[PDB]
Design an enzyme around this catalytic site. Structure first.
Site, PDB file in Angstrom:
ATOM      1  N   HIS A  18      99.465  17.612-117.088  1.00 15.73           N
ATOM      2  CA  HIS A  18      99.715  18.188-115.768  1.00 15.73           C
ATOM      3  C   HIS A  18     100.753  19.319-115.841  1.00 15.73           C
ATOM      4  O   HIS A  18     101.506  19.447-116.812  1.00 15.73           O
ATOM      5  CB  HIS A  18     100.179  17.099-114.800  1.00 15.73           C
ATOM      6  N   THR A  47      95.971  24.934-121.639  1.00 16.54           N
ATOM      7  CA  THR A  47      96.890  24.322-122.590  1.00 16.54           C
ATOM      8  C   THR A  47      96.496  24.642-124.031  1.00 16.54           C
ATOM      9  O   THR A  47      97.364  24.869-124.884  1.00 16.54           O
ATOM     10  CB  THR A  47      96.937  22.817-122.361  1.00 16.54           C
ATOM     11  N   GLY A  65      91.784  20.259-115.197  1.00 12.99           N
ATOM     12  CA  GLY A  65      91.626  19.030-114.451  1.00 12.99           C
ATOM     13  C   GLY A  65      91.001  19.211-113.071  1.00 12.99           C
ATOM     14  O   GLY A  65      89.979  18.597-112.750  1.00 12.99           O
ATOM     15  N   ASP A  70      88.746  16.577-116.698  1.00 15.31           N
ATOM     16  CA  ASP A  70      89.010  15.147-116.924  1.00 15.31           C
ATOM     17  C   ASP A  70      87.714  14.352-117.031  1.00 15.31           C
ATOM     18  O   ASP A  70      87.635  13.378-117.789  1.00 15.31           O
ATOM     19  CB  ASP A  70      89.879  14.551-115.809  1.00 15.31           C
ATOM     20  N   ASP A  90     101.555  13.475-114.457  1.00 21.23           N
ATOM     21  CA  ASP A  90     102.841  13.673-113.792  1.00 21.23           C
ATOM     22  C   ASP A  90     103.098  12.571-112.772  1.00 21.23           C
ATOM     23  O   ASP A  90     102.511  12.604-111.679  1.00 21.23           O
ATOM     24  CB  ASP A  90     102.886  15.043-113.113  1.00 21.23           C
ATOM     25  N   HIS A  97      93.394  15.908-107.606  1.00 15.11           N
ATOM     26  CA  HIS A  97      92.383  15.231-108.403  1.00 15.11           C
ATOM     27  C   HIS A  97      92.885  13.907-108.983  1.00 15.11           C
ATOM     28  O   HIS A  97      92.425  13.494-110.043  1.00 15.11           O
ATOM     29  CB  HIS A  97      91.879  16.155-109.511  1.00 15.11           C
ATOM     30  N   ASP A 100      90.194  11.620-110.327  1.00 15.97           N
ATOM     31  CA  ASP A 100      89.803  12.002-111.685  1.00 15.97           C
ATOM     32  C   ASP A 100      90.818  11.504-112.716  1.00 15.97           C
ATOM     33  O   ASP A 100      90.439  11.068-113.814  1.00 15.97           O
ATOM     34  CB  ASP A 100      89.656  13.535-111.818  1.00 15.97           C
ATOM     35  N   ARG A 106      90.901   4.862-116.692  1.00 15.19           N
ATOM     36  CA  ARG A 106      90.081   3.655-116.635  1.00 15.19           C
ATOM     37  C   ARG A 106      89.117   3.601-117.818  1.00 15.19           C
ATOM     38  O   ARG A 106      88.995   2.562-118.482  1.00 15.19           O
ATOM     39  CB  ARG A 106      89.305   3.583-115.310  1.00 15.19           C
TER      40      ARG A 106
END
EC number: 4.2.3.3
Lengths: 143, 145, 151
Positions: A18, A47, A65, A70, A90, A97, A100, A106
């Protein structure tokens, strides 16, 4: 009901951060350059280009993202194509999102890949004498 | 920061149903068979095998929702490979992959593809005379930044 | 947000937390790593502590079960710097009514930068590392300076 899958010696590593956490991620990559250089690297947003300009490592690009990256990462985890997730999300800023964000974590839990959400976890993973070994992991038996 | 993209006349349709909604989705498919035969179909879980047994339509299979199928669908939406989403999610039972469910609907909104979340909206979409022609849609211009 | 450091001791205080269908997975892990875990301080939530005492010779602090407040007990101790490692096998295939406690506990383990595992592969990387039984210096938020900025 469980089955097994083999994580390879040479790993495909997803690097996700993030906005306020991108400088924390780049400092981590810088401290472990020789440990990351022979693995395959992917990252969301820009990034990857920040890592590339500061260290020289090659990083494959994916969507940011908010635009879908993601879910791109999550789909590959579940297809057995990404082996490690470093996800510096963060905990002190709300993001639109967030679904997401939680869906991706998960799936990293469902499919039992090494996953770090902070610096010290990422250190324990990347500095481990087993990081360069093949790893046999228990996973759900989809059939 | 908007640009444009063209959905092709032959749409790649994603069909997604939660467990107690499967019956409604297959009834919708059986009612609209002659229309759907001109499009490419994908479905999460076993739903594709159900459709093919009852209609002979061809359906590409993807992972079930709990195992990551919703994110496979979302990824292709963002890549511009899925053009339409029919998502019969269940408003009267709670599922453990609810973040995945909301994340798929957020992206279908971001990328502005036709999406139906119930039976009457699905009928409006597929019965449209515009449905089997090319469709220009507004989208975010990502190649900007 | 300015950072400082703290040092996790050589003997770690480890929290052991598992959802109902993941309890057997946690005890398998505790069984394999018992020779190492005997050298650290252990706490567990709800009936997981009974299971561990019954099936091994390990001694565990009892904390409340997750739905009754145990996750917030663990979170509180994490933020106070009293818990050093979190092993949290939550269930990604079953909905739980205390999901906000589950997410808030994971949020705080991220703010305070402690070793945390949510699955077997990550738990093994942590416990098997040659660094696990030595002091560990970690980067943490500087709370006093953070407070000073909010005034």
């Amino acid at each position: 009901e469980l089955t097994t899958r083999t994580l390879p010696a040479r790993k495909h590593i997803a690097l996700v951060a993030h906005d306020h956490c991108k400088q924390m991620l780049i400092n981590w990559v810088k401290r472990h350059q020789p440990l990351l250089e022979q693995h395959a690297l992917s990252a969301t947003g820009t990034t990857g280009n920040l890592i590339e300009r500061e260290t020289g490592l090659n990083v494959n690009a994916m969507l940011s993202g908010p635009m879908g990256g993601d879910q791109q990462v999550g789909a590959q985890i579940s297809e057995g194509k990404i082996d490690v997730l470093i996800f510096f999300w963060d905990p002190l800023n709300a993001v639109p999102h967030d679904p997401d964000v939680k869906a991706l974590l998960r799936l990293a839990t469902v499919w039992n890949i090494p996953v770090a959400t902070n610096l010290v976890t990422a250190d324990f993973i990347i500095q481990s004498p087993q990081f360069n070994d093949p790893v046999e992991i228990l996973i759900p038996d989809y059939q």
